[PDB]
UniProtKB/TrEMBL annotation, chains A, B:
This is Beta-glucuronidase. NCBIfam families: PRK10150.1 (NF007538). Residues 14-173 form the Glycosyl hydrolases family 2 sugar binding domain. InterPro entries: Beta-gal/glucu_dom_sf, Galactose-bd-like_sf, GH, Glyco_hydro_2, Glyco_hydro_2_AS, Glyco_hydro_2_cat, Glyco_hydro_2_CS, Glyco_hydro_2_N. One of its GO terms (molecular function) is carbohydrate binding. One of its GO terms (biological process) is glucuronoside catabolic process. PROSITE patterns: GLYCOSYL_HYDROL_F2_1, GLYCOSYL_HYDROL_F2_2. Its EC number is 3.2.1.31. It comes from Lachnospira eligens. Keywords: Glycosidase, Hydrolase. Belongs to the glycosyl hydrolase 2 family. Residues 266-574 form the Glycoside hydrolase family 2 catalytic domain. Residues 175-264 form the Glycoside hydrolase family 2 immunoglobulin-like beta-sandwich domain. It holds the Pfam family Glyco_hydro_2_C.
Length: 580, 580
């Protein structure tokens, strides 16, 4: 369980972000005890941020192995009173915290938070904090390092690493709040729908009371109970592009924490994805925590810029593509009313492109245990987010291979059981699968395709490509379930133009999406269009990557390609609800 | 009078185009007799083409003065039988032909054809042809060289010079055809309109008979008479975007020449520009004979490409901006059905931007005599072109200054009297004039404005700019005449993009034209929208020119800016006829 550190009367918060000392491991790093003494001949390195692009030459950009972040720490003795904790929101890949020279914590997983307490190794005076980060990826990591001394991603984005998100120090009373959970039942029956919310607070280390406020701070109800309930008639339902967030003050044993919460219902019904009992239609794109020169590092300004562009463009949703995003971005979609598809680090679980099969148990992937710890850690983190309407177990696994069904079912189950809101589960299907062959047809509530008819398939022949896409999508309808496209797009170099289009031209990109959009619009069970990608992003080099991935509607610096004006006009004529 | 040299049973045609010898005058050129001996230490230089960009360094690009083209010539004695003529379709600025060392011809005016006969200095064997070209521009040239050793154009395009169009050698019988003229009267009354055409052939140095064919070569009528007539019931009327061209074989004294001709009526009526008695609406742009690295040189392929793009874009017209275009392009618009506004070299007749006034007679411009010879030479050349529906006496003269009316009336008159079809006359008004102040309000059948509300005026404030444009255009309506915009646009660097537009961005360009187009659409007396410019073109350097003029809808190599897709959608929903 991981609550978002905030400033409360009961808890303090001090950011450690800034320029830290930094050294690339030379192999002999751990041998000598760098985590013991202050790094020598060190380099400077802002935190929070990916370090790959922040220096010059390939030696930083393409480093294999470990790096050492190092910074000094010092708390006021008058604080030992309360509990001292170190929250690392995300260290890409493996983290190893040393204080004063001793290991204190260790973590696997580059995109989710982890904490460690400091009360009993926090010395007096100036303490030597050391965070060593490893970037190696393999068949035991999610995301999955392939075989082709260098990391070779089995995924189409660059392997940005370092202290990707912030490192803070918060405190707490000795017995504290540790995990608040809230769910809602809404009775749309009444012409003025109302709702009953179920609280479930948890403490560790006494009386606990719950206060419920409205948008403006107006209190409206109170109760006591580490597992009580609450009633709200004439309830302001959170809605896509129309967020309403209540707030919640849990006072419990000299400790109080506040939580926003939006009241809405998610439910699949036949070929309809329903939000607050209405037939939604996804409009938006798959995104990437990718900016220059931050790498995958957190970027509050671009977060707001990205959401400003989405509203300008008349979109309503995005998918945390290939990894969970920052907590800040998740809260922002709550405030702004952005429907989010929250997705795990499970990309590259596919060895298809003697031959080893993906789910061979001696020579194939070794990810299921960690895949489970991710599903749990992620749902623990974002369970209370009204923006989250669905979960994505994995992006493009070899889901039509043998071993496939056996791999994923234990993970779907774990997901369906750990979501206090029992939200729809899916996985994003790669090109090649079909209704009959895809283990997703059974395990998933929503069929999410990534199809590229007009690019990989059939490009530059958009007629032949249309025939293919009708044929395949037609078949997908026989499952009687909601199907949305989570990726489709074409690599386009901003600036390349032509009257009779050729591939890579802004005109070819617009035509591609006209064909796909025409076919989408023929099937009432298509409940979503999400283009890949929102914006150009960095990938590993290869002959097929024109200085990265150029499938964005926008450039890496958020300037619109012609296609961005095509979608803005199309999405403006398509409602959040009732499109079918 | 100048007929377009073609291949006829009576006349031969041999192109002299190719790589000629070429030398930049060093001042001492004429002193020594370069036109006498073969140039020494010469350079290579294709003809036909502007020479400025065909070499490296500023020394070619920015040469002040004379250059010497030189090529060898040799005719088969068995030709002396017939008349031998040298037709120079266009030598930019001043031309001076030498044969074997003797001057044979001289010309002023860089954009119209001129010929000279060779029978009596054409030696036997190999003859030394020499064409010396001068690029100097001043208050006595059209276009007008300003005061700010270098040419400073008082016009916004680069001063490309050299043998701009081709040099050929044709022959003729001794008594020959010299100028055919045809006009038409159509009786739209009948439900199957018919027409009577009036021939007017001219010979110099005998029987002459006229044959009339249809599109496919089917003869349909014959007659005799150097000034006879002809009748055609159920006539195929040439029409915008629907050309029908009859042909005409004038056999006369062992000499025959063929001429295409289209039957259509042009007539202004109130606030309506009527073609074949219907209310036309101009759709298109102002263009420039500008390609790389040809300079202003002729370019048959780009001519066809430009016309292909216009049909793709759903345009119907263009203006020979700032100079008459090649004969080939003029014939092409006949074949393809492009309405053309034929315009003279008279740009820069405006000194506004002790102070000298434009039409001061000692210190101002000295162009009226030549301006007249241009009006005559031009109408003599293009009189029979169905594509030509209007004449432009001058682009942006100081038409609201004193002396203005006196300057232009003699030229309007000369124009209105020399057009066998009595076609509408105009001049294109610069920013600043108004209905009351513009000598064009009286002399012109169509008010043609060049306004820049949104750029020079008011940019980046498109609201304030709209208020200005409504205010001014409103007033222009009080004249009860047809008003079309012949220029409006905004400098746009292909590739610069933004969601919240800034000037120079493809998005700002599209918004500019949306505002102007909205206001245009409010006034039923606006009969035309022609954007400036069709494509990016070269200008003299200055702080206000981003590597030339970037106001094109297309780049200099004909690739579309976003705005080119905005117009194509708008023009597709606007008819050639009946828009009002
Ligand atoms: C019709 N038959 C084909 N089907 C396919 S599929 C495929 C392929 N994957 C697709 C799916 N993406 C997904 O989409 C995005 C992207 O690819 O840009 C990624 O950014 C994103 O992270 C990822 O989710 C990951 C990788 N990569 N390369 N070639 C192909 C290919 C080809 C053909 C025909 C021969 C040529 C290649
Ligand atoms: C609203 N008040 C103004 N009005 C005007 S007018 C003007 C100006 N001319 C206009 C008209 N063009 C014509 O249009 C094209 C073009 O300009 O690109 C040319 O290519 C084309 O050959 C030619 O026909 C020739 C030149 N050049 N520079 N500044 C201005 C200016 C300015 C202001 C305010 C201050 C800033 C400058
Ligand atoms: C794991 N992600 C991928 N998935 C796929 S699928 C497919 C294909 N197709 C699919 C349709 N059926 C016929 C064969 N052809 N070539 N490459 C691919 C392909 C690739 C990758 C990533 C590595 C590069 C190629
Ligand atoms: C001959 N072509 C021009 N015409 C014009 S008109 C105008 C203006 N305006 C017009 C509206 N009334 C208020 C003043 N301001 N600045 N420059 C100009 C201007 C220029 C040129 C060419 C040289 C550069 C400037």
């Amino acid at each position: 369980a991981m609550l978002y550190p905030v400033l409360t009367q009961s808890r303090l918060l001090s950011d450690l972000s800034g320029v830290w000392n930094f050294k690339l491991d030379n192999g002999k790093g751990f041998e000598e005890k760098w985590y013991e003494k202050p790094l020598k001949d060190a380099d400077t390195m802002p935190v929070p941020a990916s370090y790959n692009d922040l220096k010059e030459g390939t030696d930083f950009r393409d480093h294999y192995g470990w790096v050492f972040y190092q910074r000094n720490i010092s708390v006021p003795e008058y604080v030992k009173s309360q509990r001292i904790v170190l929250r690392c929101a995300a260290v890409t890949h493996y983290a190893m915290i040393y204080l004063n020279g001793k290991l204190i914590c260790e973590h696997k997983g580059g995109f989710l938070p982890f904490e460690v307490e400091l009360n009993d190794d926090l010395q007096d005076g100036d303490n030597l904090l050391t965070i060593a980060v490893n970037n190696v990826i393999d068949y035991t990591t999610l995301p999955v390092g392939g075989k082709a001394p260098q990391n070779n991603p089995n995924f189409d984005f660059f392997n940005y690493c370092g202290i990707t998100r912030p490192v803070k120090i918060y405190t707490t009373p000795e017995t504290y709040i540790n995990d608040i959970t809230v769910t809602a039942d809404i009775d749309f029956t009444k012409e003025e729908p109302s709702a009953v919310l179920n609280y479930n607070v948890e403490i560790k280390g006494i009386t606990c009371k719950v206060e419920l406020f409205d948008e403006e701070g107006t209190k409206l109800s109170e109760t006591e109970g580490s597992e009580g309930t609450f009633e709200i008639s004439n309830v302001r339902l959170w809605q896509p592009l129309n967020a309403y967030l209540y707030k919640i003050k849990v006072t419990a044993g000299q400790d109080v924490y506040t939580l926003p919460y939006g009241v809405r219902s998610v439910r699949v019904d036949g070929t309809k994805f329903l939000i607050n009992e209405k037939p939604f239609y996804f409009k938006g794109y798959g995104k990437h925590e990718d900016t220059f020169p931050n790498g995958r590092g957190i970027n509050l300004p671009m977060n707001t810029k990205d959401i400003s562009i989405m509203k300008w463009q008349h979109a309503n949703s995005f998918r945390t593509s290939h990894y969970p995003y920052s907590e800040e971005m998740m809260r922002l979609c709550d405030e702004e009313g952005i429907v989010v598809i929250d997705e795990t680090t499970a990309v590259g679980v596919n060895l298809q492109f003697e031959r080893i099969g993906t789910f061979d148990k001696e020579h194939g992937v070794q990810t299921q245990e960690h895949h489970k710890d991710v599903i749990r850690d992620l749902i623990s983190r974002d369970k209370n987010h009204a923006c989250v309407v669905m979960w994505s177990i994995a992006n493009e696994p070899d889901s039509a291979a043998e071993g496939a069904y056996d791999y994923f079912k234990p993970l779907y189950d774990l997901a369906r059981e750990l979501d206090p809101q029992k939200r729809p589960c899916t996985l994003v299907s790669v090109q090649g699968t079909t209704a009959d062959t895809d283990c997703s047809s059974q395990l998933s509530d929503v069929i999410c395709l990534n199809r590229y008819y007009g690019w990989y398939f059939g490009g530059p022949d958009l007629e032949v490509s249309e025939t293919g896409l009708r044929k395949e999508l037609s078949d997908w309808g026989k499952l009687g379930k909601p199907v949305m496209f989570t990726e489709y797009g074409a690599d386009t170099v901003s600036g390349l133009h032509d009257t009779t289009s050729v591939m890579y031209t802004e005109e070819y990109q617009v035509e591609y999406y006209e064909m796909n959009n025409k076919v989408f619009d023929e099937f009432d069970f298509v409940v979503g269009e999400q283009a890949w990608n929102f914006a150009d992003f960095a990938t590993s080099q290869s002959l097929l990557r024109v200085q990265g991935n150029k499938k964005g509607l926008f450039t890496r610096d958020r300037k619109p390609k012609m296609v961005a004006h095509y979608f803005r006009n199309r999405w403006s004529a398509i409602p959040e609800f009732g499109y079918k």
